[PDB]
Design an enzyme around this catalytic site. Sequence first.
Site, mmCIF file in Angstrom:
data_model
loop_
_atom_site.group_PDB
_atom_site.id
_atom_site.type_symbol
_atom_site.label_atom_id
_atom_site.label_comp_id
_atom_site.label_asym_id
_atom_site.label_seq_id
_atom_site.Cartn_x
_atom_site.Cartn_y
_atom_site.Cartn_z
ATOM 1 N N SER A 97 54.791 28.723 56.012
ATOM 2 C CA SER A 97 54.602 29.893 56.792
ATOM 3 C C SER A 97 53.268 30.609 56.579
ATOM 4 O O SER A 97 52.849 30.859 55.445
ATOM 5 C CB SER A 97 55.684 30.941 56.443
ATOM 6 O OG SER A 97 55.635 31.982 57.412
ATOM 7 N N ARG A 157 21.665 17.004 53.747
ATOM 8 C CA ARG A 157 21.454 15.645 53.262
ATOM 9 C C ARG A 157 22.205 15.346 51.940
ATOM 10 O O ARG A 157 22.574 14.229 51.678
ATOM 11 C CB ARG A 157 19.950 15.350 53.151
ATOM 12 C CG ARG A 157 19.243 16.112 52.061
ATOM 13 C CD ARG A 157 17.709 15.951 52.099
ATOM 14 N NE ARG A 157 17.023 16.822 53.043
ATOM 15 C CZ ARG A 157 16.885 18.137 52.884
ATOM 16 N NH1 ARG A 157 17.391 18.748 51.815
ATOM 17 N NH2 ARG A 157 16.300 18.844 53.805
ATOM 18 N N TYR A 190 24.857 30.697 33.412
ATOM 19 C CA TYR A 190 24.033 31.511 32.569
ATOM 20 C C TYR A 190 22.533 31.269 32.905
ATOM 21 O O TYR A 190 22.159 30.177 33.313
ATOM 22 C CB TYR A 190 24.284 31.119 31.117
ATOM 23 C CG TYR A 190 25.755 31.168 30.796
ATOM 24 C CD1 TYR A 190 26.351 32.335 30.407
ATOM 25 C CD2 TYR A 190 26.556 30.030 30.922
ATOM 26 C CE1 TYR A 190 27.702 32.394 30.149
ATOM 27 C CE2 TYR A 190 27.907 30.082 30.655
ATOM 28 C CZ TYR A 190 28.459 31.293 30.270
ATOM 29 O OH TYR A 190 29.793 31.386 30.046
ATOM 30 N N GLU A 193 13.424 27.426 45.508
ATOM 31 C CA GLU A 193 14.551 27.372 46.448
ATOM 32 C C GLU A 193 14.735 25.930 46.918
ATOM 33 O O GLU A 193 15.894 25.450 47.136
ATOM 34 C CB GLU A 193 14.312 28.266 47.609
ATOM 35 C CG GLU A 193 15.445 28.329 48.632
ATOM 36 C CD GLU A 193 15.451 27.184 49.683
ATOM 37 O OE1 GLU A 193 14.501 26.342 49.710
ATOM 38 O OE2 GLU A 193 16.385 27.186 50.516
ATOM 39 N N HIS A 203 34.229 33.564 47.148
ATOM 40 C CA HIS A 203 34.608 34.339 48.284
ATOM 41 C C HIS A 203 35.774 33.647 48.966
ATOM 42 O O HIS A 203 35.712 32.441 49.233
ATOM 43 C CB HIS A 203 33.451 34.428 49.278
ATOM 44 C CG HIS A 203 33.477 35.628 50.167
ATOM 45 N ND1 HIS A 203 34.362 35.740 51.217
ATOM 46 C CD2 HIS A 203 32.717 36.743 50.198
ATOM 47 C CE1 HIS A 203 34.144 36.885 51.850
ATOM 48 N NE2 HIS A 203 33.142 37.493 51.271
ATOM 49 N N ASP A 239 31.138 53.847 47.818
ATOM 50 C CA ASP A 239 31.643 52.850 46.878
ATOM 51 C C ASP A 239 32.710 51.998 47.517
ATOM 52 O O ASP A 239 32.713 50.791 47.355
ATOM 53 C CB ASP A 239 32.092 53.466 45.543
ATOM 54 C CG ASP A 239 30.964 53.896 44.700
ATOM 55 O OD1 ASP A 239 29.800 53.671 45.118
ATOM 56 O OD2 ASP A 239 31.161 54.499 43.591
HETATM 57 CA CA LIG Z 1 21.812 28.747 35.136
HETATM 58 ZN ZN LIG Z 2 12.978 27.548 52.964
HETATM 59 ZN ZN LIG Z 3 13.142 24.305 53.016
#
Ligand SMILES: [Ca+2]
Ligand SMILES: [Zn+2]
Ligand SMILES: [Zn+2]
Lengths: 694, 694
Positions: free
Chosen positions: A572, A156, A218, A370, A633, A610
């Site tokens: 290319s 959204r 930070y 979250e 990434h 590693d």
């Molecule tokens: Ca922060």
């Molecule tokens: Zn969730």
């Molecule tokens: Zn959710």
Amino acid sequence: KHNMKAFLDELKAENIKKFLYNFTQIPHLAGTEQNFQLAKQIQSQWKEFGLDSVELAHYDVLLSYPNKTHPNYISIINEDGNEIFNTSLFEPPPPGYENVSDIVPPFSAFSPQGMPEGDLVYVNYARTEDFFKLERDMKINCSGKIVIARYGKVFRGNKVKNAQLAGAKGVILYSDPADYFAPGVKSYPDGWNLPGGGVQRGNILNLNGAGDPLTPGYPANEYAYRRGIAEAVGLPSIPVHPIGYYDAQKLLEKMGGSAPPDSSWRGSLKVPYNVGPGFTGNFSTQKVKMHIHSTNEVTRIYNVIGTLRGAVEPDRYVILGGHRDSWVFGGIDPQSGAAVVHEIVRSFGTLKKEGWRPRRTILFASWDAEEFGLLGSTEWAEENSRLLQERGVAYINADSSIEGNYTLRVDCTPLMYSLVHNLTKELKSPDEGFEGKSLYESWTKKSPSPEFSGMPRISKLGSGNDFEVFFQRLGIASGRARYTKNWETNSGYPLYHSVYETYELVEKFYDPMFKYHLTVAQVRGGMVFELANSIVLPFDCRDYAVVLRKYADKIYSISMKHPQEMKTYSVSFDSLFSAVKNFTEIASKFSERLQDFDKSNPIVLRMMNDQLMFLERAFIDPLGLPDRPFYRHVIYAPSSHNKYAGESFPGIYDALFDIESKVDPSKAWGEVKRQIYVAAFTVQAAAETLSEVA
Amino acid sequence: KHNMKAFLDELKAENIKKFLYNFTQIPHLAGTEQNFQLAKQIQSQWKEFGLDSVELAHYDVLLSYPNKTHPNYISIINEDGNEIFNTSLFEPPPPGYENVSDIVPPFSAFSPQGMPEGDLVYVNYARTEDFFKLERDMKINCSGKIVIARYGKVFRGNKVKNAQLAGAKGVILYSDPADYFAPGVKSYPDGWNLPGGGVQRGNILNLNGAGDPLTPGYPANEYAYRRGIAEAVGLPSIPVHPIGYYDAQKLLEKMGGSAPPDSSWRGSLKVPYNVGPGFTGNFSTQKVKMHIHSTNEVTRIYNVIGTLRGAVEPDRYVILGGHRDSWVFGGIDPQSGAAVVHEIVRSFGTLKKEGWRPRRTILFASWDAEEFGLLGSTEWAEENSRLLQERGVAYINADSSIEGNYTLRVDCTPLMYSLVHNLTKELKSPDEGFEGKSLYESWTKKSPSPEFSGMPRISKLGSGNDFEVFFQRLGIASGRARYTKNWETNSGYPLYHSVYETYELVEKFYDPMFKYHLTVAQVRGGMVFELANSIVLPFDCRDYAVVLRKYADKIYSISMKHPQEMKTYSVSFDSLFSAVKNFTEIASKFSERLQDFDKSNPIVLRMMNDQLMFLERAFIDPLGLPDRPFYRHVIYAPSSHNKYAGESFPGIYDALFDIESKVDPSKAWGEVKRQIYVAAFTVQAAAETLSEVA
Ligand SMILES: [Ca+2]
Ligand SMILES: [Zn+2]
Ligand SMILES: [Zn+2]
Ligand SMILES: *[C@@H]1O[C@H](CO)[C@@H](O[C@@H]2O[C@H](CO)[C@@H](O[C@@H]3O[C@H](CO[C@H]4O[C@H](CO)[C@@H](O)[C@H](O)[C@@H]4O)[C@@H](O)[C@H](O[C@H]4O[C@H](CO)[C@@H](O)[C@H](O)[C@@H]4O)[C@@H]3O)[C@H](O)[C@H]2NC(C)=O)[C@H](O)[C@H]1NC(C)=O
Ligand SMILES: *[C@@H]1O[C@H](CO)[C@@H](O[C@@H]2O[C@H](CO)[C@@H](O[C@@H]3O[C@H](CO[C@H]4O[C@H](CO)[C@@H](O)[C@H](O)[C@@H]4O)[C@@H](O)[C@H](O[C@H]4O[C@H](CO)[C@@H](O)[C@H](O)[C@@H]4O)[C@@H]3O)[C@H](O)[C@H]2NC(C)=O)[C@H](O)[C@H]1NC(C)=O
Ligand SMILES: *[C@@H]1O[C@H](CO)[C@@H](O[C@@H]2O[C@H](CO)[C@@H](O)[C@H](O)[C@H]2NC(C)=O)[C@H](O)[C@H]1NC(C)=O
Ligand SMILES: *[C@@H]1O[C@H](CO)[C@@H](O[C@@H]2O[C@H](CO)[C@@H](O)[C@H](O)[C@H]2NC(C)=O)[C@H](O)[C@H]1NC(C)=O
Ligand SMILES: *[C@@H]1O[C@H](CO)[C@@H](O[C@@H]2O[C@H](CO)[C@@H](O)[C@H](O)[C@H]2NC(C)=O)[C@H](O)[C@H]1NC(C)=O
Ligand SMILES: *[C@@H]1O[C@H](CO)[C@@H](O[C@@H]2O[C@H](CO)[C@@H](O)[C@H](O)[C@H]2NC(C)=O)[C@H](O)[C@H]1NC(C)=O
Ligand SMILES: *[C@@H]1O[C@H](CO)[C@@H](O[C@@H]2O[C@H](CO)[C@@H](O)[C@H](O)[C@H]2NC(C)=O)[C@H](O)[C@H]1NC(C)=O
Ligand SMILES: *[C@@H]1O[C@H](CO)[C@@H](O[C@@H]2O[C@H](CO)[C@@H](O)[C@H](O)[C@H]2NC(C)=O)[C@H](O)[C@H]1NC(C)=O
Ligand SMILES: *[C@@H]1O[C@H](CO)[C@@H](O[C@@H]2O[C@H](CO)[C@@H](O)[C@H](O)[C@H]2NC(C)=O)[C@H](O)[C@H]1NC(C)=O
Ligand SMILES: *[C@@H]1O[C@H](CO)[C@@H](O[C@@H]2O[C@H](CO)[C@@H](O)[C@H](O)[C@H]2NC(C)=O)[C@H](O)[C@H]1NC(C)=O
Ligand SMILES: *[C@@H]1O[C@H](CO)[C@@H](O)[C@H](O)[C@H]1NC(C)=O
Ligand SMILES: *[C@@H]1O[C@H](CO)[C@@H](O)[C@H](O)[C@H]1NC(C)=O
Ligand SMILES: *[C@@H]1O[C@H](CO)[C@@H](O)[C@H](O)[C@H]1NC(C)=O
Ligand SMILES: *[C@@H]1O[C@H](CO)[C@@H](O)[C@H](O)[C@H]1NC(C)=O
Ligand SMILES: [Ca+2]
Ligand SMILES: [Cl-]
Ligand SMILES: [Cl-]
Ligand SMILES: [Zn+2]
Ligand SMILES: [Zn+2]
């Protein structure tokens, strides 16, 4: 024996069910007291369960809440300014919860305040392509209009960004039964469909990985210096509000101007789905007026961080993480994941009390906020980024365990493809008609990969969850797994982010025996167990070589729609294909060594572990992607058009996107070539980390 | 035994002398054929010397050269446009080299072409403060003037940047005998002073760590996409040329306008050192005219990369690196360092042929194009940045071994302070009057630290050499060491970057027995030997704790000159001091563990070596410093006013610099506080990498 089987057998469906009921009786909104109490409970129980340490990490972040005494709503308003229709102030609470306090009414987190008034335009899903159709083909101008868009297809926040760049002065989001009402199934409480008064909450930020809008880079700790709101990352500039289809019907039924351009613009309500602008003749003097009075404020949030110290490589971290904050009761989202994590912790705790310790350290996390932008996970990772970049083996996410009851769904890095295949062959399918067969078998049967016979679909990681900072910013191998619906015959689950997402929803209509939950607990937990205990890290670099070639073919094909420009500007892909070939050869030689190396030697073993750990890391560019510094990434980023979807070679993809519309083609193709160079270099560089080291 | 003593005893003064003579017979200018031939020789001899592999790594980078058929020079020009005085076209070649071909004439690398004409202003050393005096106090406006500045005090690139921001339309640099003629010593060839016709070459870029101006971030390899010149990093926008004091006298003797403001503006030539603008009355119609026709061009450069594979931790890299390219013969700079490296390689090669291998891998590098902006080192590190960030233990630089014959000079990270102290106590002083005493003793006697009785001065690392990318961009512990002059009684050495820098200069006037060279070879080589072979890495995190407190006190004191603003804006250093306290406590506990940990356990040993290796790394901010993205170390950056000088807490320093002149004090103090937060966080974060890991 203390082995994986012991771990797995200790997990109980009945325990998950208890935990879920326990986590879903009251709302646990980020930044509220109730969610702090649940954090303290989770901490105290993880301690009882056996973990070596269990701490709260808190931060002070920008959250967003409606004004309790000044409710948000939308109106149709007449020539005199009478409000002749008002959208609802709350969803009808479900049976038995009609006296629960503190149910946050539907709102779009982070919307600025305002009371704009104007004519509606209807923009379908408010995708990039919906606006292209509208502006380029239909010649409809959204400037100074209020747009109304149906939820679905994309995140959204992207819809709001798109609307805003088209000049809209407000956005109304609604749930169309085409996307949130499955045919033949009843509305909550008698089925799992969305009722007409149900509304989807959710934030509408464009953070591009930043975390707390005020503290990018930070952690938002006690002495943090914060940006002013005007310089904050990702806030929308126009008011936004979400509504149900009963209300949406009333807003759309009077719509005039142009017809929809085709049937992919028509939902299922009994209205024409005219694009507008504005209402038909009789009502053409009526307008829509929004009233938004939500406030952004800095609020403390709390992650719970549990540690189970490794016996041999305590300085290597396998992380199992998922959020705890919910929009309301969080019966699916997140508590169905959190209950799974809780029982995973208990099982690992059981082995530990009998004297076992995993080889590597396992960190368990209950993230906060979250729902307001991946904030808890992101701040914690900003705080601990040096530890994570040098010690982080893998991150397994643990949000919703179910969004359906049909089959398994896995999104992960290629480095875990083999681990997932192997683990699933050893697990029992919980599916009807696959008694005594393996999870791999049923999953492969019901969700076949497009690429290979006798293998399951595994998707690339996008964003819109707490693995984002780990994978896309930091380059830690990441994955996620849950039970899902059948896409062939059937937007996610209808009651997503609604008050109707309850324990009962799950126990009655999704997983009454809790067997899909138990299977997800085995997949998640099993991944973590192998990551943390296998002597050699269970990643196969050759699986990366295979997808890298597929992505290179894909991005080449996109470019090849402009053959004339590829000739004129000397564009290319040779270098990218060369790097991918080298990566394949070097990876093949590394696997031979990994198989043949001298098993007795711990240094040799650590060297090669590693190299496996740092391989995902090698795909990070510290300069980031263009204008998105926290997406680092090179192979995967969230789609610039849809935060939930992963894009491969995003730097090149975005430089190619809509390139035929750029006014300086020389400059645009230049940037294509720049991104090709970046990609080829990074792929070669990653392959080189798998060469003999000296 | 194959131990350090064996390594050290195999080093011979006589060998260094031979190598230096061999490396200094013809010019080895970056990008020329001769410098390619020397690279191939060095490669073939490092192979003979015993290294496991020896490769050339090449790149195509932006270099700069005069036009052979269209010479650069400066004129005094009259009212009619007659050129009545011309600066020299070349330096008088030294005795015996008057028939050497390919001696590049003096020029300022990377200067754009132009023939500007105008009145001179004399700006002393063209420091930030010289321009402040000129503009603020004397009210002299350099806009549209040609400025003339004396070399010294700061990096010439800074002078040019300063001149350019003051509006100059060209810059003339010259060597004043005040700064390049030591009293009582004769000019070359009869002494080590600079003759009046001698000129200092050197680039005038402001790269701020970028490397190749066209390819910031990525190696300049075969498929690199390059910026257009207009978007290139660090190029000056006004023409620049350097001259000797015979020529400078002629340009300055007619100068009028204001007098110098004080004696710190007066050099040693017999001229008034008037600031101007322009010439005195009779000549006031004469002007200065520059003619610059140098071209920038992309040219291939070659590093030589030698590997000696480690027996136990082959995936850990100790790097000994120094450049090979010279402005002309490079008798001091760089070949006196390179000959030292060559003999270091030979000695390690001797041990290896008798079956020894160091514990960790040693990489040896002969960098190219250092003189044109640290380009070879920087490109190689951009190419190999993933390997270096996860495997790089330490970098020891190896440019000029001598710039004097008085005592040792060391600049390094605090993490090597103890290593350096210990190694030097075990080395013999080569100094007159210290026969049978230790290097530590003589060094401490002649160069006492300001801070502590009975200890030597060790300075912080700035920039202007090949360690820059390793330390300031990547965060690999770095150091350098050479013999130097006595600052008390006595700009570096007078013949710096002049044709007069020859083998003979060294053999006759600096180090006839090659004993200072041998001592520097022991210090450099000894550092590398310990880094590569000590079981526990020879870094002491507590030495960082000590300087961190000193830096915090220093930056606090700078702020405290504005007490009123610190009150009004609530500017606190509490968080930084707190972080430094924590770092001290945590570091102290880590040292106890490092001492008491169980010596048998290789994993525990690797864990703790990783914590020592990653400690320097922990000071890197991946966002970089403001507007300088390749300076990422939070504790040290090159001074924004002088690339050669290191600044501590540069983010805060720069936010405080000249703050009383900013027009929005609220905004300026805001940024101070931001940088304090950044610093305190980073220090705490670094300390946390030394906590128990789980
Ligand atoms: Ca922060
Ligand atoms: Zn969730
Ligand atoms: Zn959710
Ligand atoms: C995939 O993996 C392979 C390794 O197998 C890489 O192949 C390298 O490809 C590069 C570019 O294609 C080659 O570059 C060429 O190097 C020549 C010199 O090579 C030798 O000398 C070097 C030391 O400098 C050694 O390291 C090397 O082993 C060789 O001995 C140059 O002469 C070439 O330049 C000239 O020709 C080019 C092409 O027309 C002109 O543009 C130049 O102006 C000049 O005339 C050229 O630069 C390289 O040698 C190959 N290496 C190896 C070990 O074989 C691929 O590059 C890699 N793919 C990616 C994407 O990285
Ligand atoms: C140097 O090292 C020390 C560790 O010894 C750090 O000290 C920490 O300091 C911070 C900030 O000064 C303390 O923060 C405070 O946390 C309180 C809660 O702490 C407890 O609960 C947490 C879990 O969330 C545990 O981790 C912790 O051990 C405690 O049990 C809060 O209540 C405080 O907030 C309140 O008071 C403040 C101050 O007036 C108000 O602004 C708030 O609005 C609120 O009322 C506060 O946030 C922290 O607890 C200390 N940790 C420890 C382990 O002692 C230093 O921070 C560190 N220096 C640097 C630069 O990092
Ligand atoms: C969820 O489960 C927890 C723990 O089993 C319950 O919390 C306990 O409740 C009683 C208070 O009635 C206390 O004596 C215990 O101290 C609590 N334990 C902890 C760890 O907090 C909690 O009541 C349950 N919540 C619901 C809604 O059922
Ligand atoms: C939420 O809205 C309420 C009620 O409409 C706001 O309270 C009013 O604010 C003004 C000025 O700030 C006062 O003069 C009124 O007396 C207040 N009314 C009441 C009933 O308290 C309140 O400002 C808003 N809350 C937030 C968090 O913004
Ligand atoms: C929609 O909501 C508004 C706001 O509560 C209602 O309008 C208010 O009605 C009261 C009493 O009728 C008036 O005193 C207020 O002045 C009105 N405020 C505004 C802003 O109009 C409106 O009646 C409601 N409409 C419907 C159809 O229910
Ligand atoms: C998944 O299991 C496969 C099949 O057992 C593993 O591949 C085998 O691994 C051993 C190395 O220990 C080899 O000796 C076998 O030859 C491999 N067989 C095949 C067909 O490759 C594979 O390693 C497992 N993957 C992971 C990540 O553990
Ligand atoms: C510097 O020393 C080297 C090597 O000892 C000299 O190069 C050798 O010279 C002869 C050609 O006369 C060849 O036979 C050898 O093959 C060369 N060796 C290598 C490794 O290149 C070189 O001549 C010396 N240079 C000067 C100016 O004295
Ligand atoms: C160096 O300067 C020379 C000589 O003044 C340049 O050569 C001239 O360039 C122009 C046009 O480009 C020609 O018409 C002349 O015939 C050339 N003269 C000679 C003697 O060749 C040359 O362009 C410059 N070189 C570089 C690298 O810029
Ligand atoms: C300084 O150099 C310039 C350039 O070579 C000299 O001026 C040239 O002189 C020749 C012959 O006298 C003329 O044909 C050219 O036209 C002149 N060119 C220019 C640009 O002036 C000048 O004579 C030299 N001055 C001194 C004092 O040596
Ligand atoms: C420099 O040498 C000092 C003095 O020998 C070393 O410090 C000693 O190291 C051992 C640890 O192996 C301790 O047992 C001694 O107690 C230490 N003595 C003191 C006074 O600290 C120091 O480790 C050396 N530094 C480095 C980097 O090697
Ligand atoms: C849309 O309308 C606004 C305001 O009236 C105007 O500024 C803008 O140019 C219009 N766009 C187009 C494509 O007509
Ligand atoms: C549970 O399973 C059956 C599949 O046979 C399906 O008809 C029902 O729709 C499923 N429940 C949910 C919530 O999808
Ligand atoms: C310096 O001179 C230029 C050009 O004549 C002018 O634009 C500029 O303002 C002057 N600066 C001051 C401080 O007078
Ligand atoms: C060498 O040593 C003596 C110090 O006694 C000094 O007078 C001479 O200046 C030195 N040489 C150089 C180049 O500094
Ligand atoms: Ca570069
Ligand atoms: Cl998930
Ligand atoms: Cl040096
Ligand atoms: Zn040098
Ligand atoms: Zn130099």
